[PDB]
């Protein structure tokens, strides 16, 4: 079994993102305030991390996704999740 | 062995927290300024994540436990930790 | 092979840091707006959380690093990396 999460915040409502690393797959819950709700990241990993910051009112999120020793980085900009320029040589 | 940590801070001097999980249990350690000790929580579960945020000055802290394959959501509001409305299906 | 991430990230720029564990190793990957770039954090470890918090202009950066169950903090207070007072008793 064994699940492996990682947890963001922002606001005073606030809102949290979780993601879940299960059986090399992350995807994320969300809470705006009022009950939690699938988000849309689904993308492949066995270890996540996540940060996430406010430009005025708009959030950005980063998420560490990594298989192996492969880290890939997702970004959140208030449209869409699209792959990062990160790189590590692991 | 092998003991996994979660960490999260507030404010400026800063209060610091820090969660590990060992050997299917998790306890706390806190930094208020001025050495280090032991915080009250104390929940079972093999991996943690955390994330914290701020109304005006009063804290509030979710820690993310997980043990196997189930994940259960733990709130600092101020005043004892209670178990929070998270849910996933994995 | 299995690495293990932790980040953090501040201001609105940002300045993000992802460190990852791999093998006994932990390093830094570090990202100012253009380009990222390895960090000056090098420590031995198979776990890693980490937490950072502005003090005005000044980032303070707090990295847990773990080997087997004993964690060491490690502390960026804008010159050097330094080992910080944390103990716990796993
Ligand atoms: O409101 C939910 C949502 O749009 O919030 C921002 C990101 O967390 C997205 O993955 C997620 O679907
Ligand atoms: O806009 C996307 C981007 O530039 O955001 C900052 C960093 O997360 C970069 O790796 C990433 O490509
Ligand atoms: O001052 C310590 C304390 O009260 O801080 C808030 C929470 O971290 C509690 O678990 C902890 O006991
Ligand atoms: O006051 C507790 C609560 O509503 O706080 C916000 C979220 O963490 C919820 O899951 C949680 O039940
Ligand atoms: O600009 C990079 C750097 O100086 O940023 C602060 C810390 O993350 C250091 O380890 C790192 O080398
Ligand atoms: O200046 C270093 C220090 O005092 O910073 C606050 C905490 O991280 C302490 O463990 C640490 O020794």
Do not use: M
């Amino acid at each position: 079994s064994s699940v492996q999460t990682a947890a963001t915040s922002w606001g005073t409502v606030p809102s949290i993102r979780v993601y879940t690393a299960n059986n090399g797959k992350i995807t994320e819950r969300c809470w705006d305030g009022k009950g939690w709700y699938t988000g849309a990241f689904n993308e492949p990993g066995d270890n996540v991390s996540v940060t996430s910051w406010l430009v005025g009112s708009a959030i950005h999120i980063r998420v560490y996704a990594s298989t192996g020793t492969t880290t890939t980085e997702w970004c959140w900009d208030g449209n869409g999740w699209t792959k990062g320029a990160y790189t590590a040589t692991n």
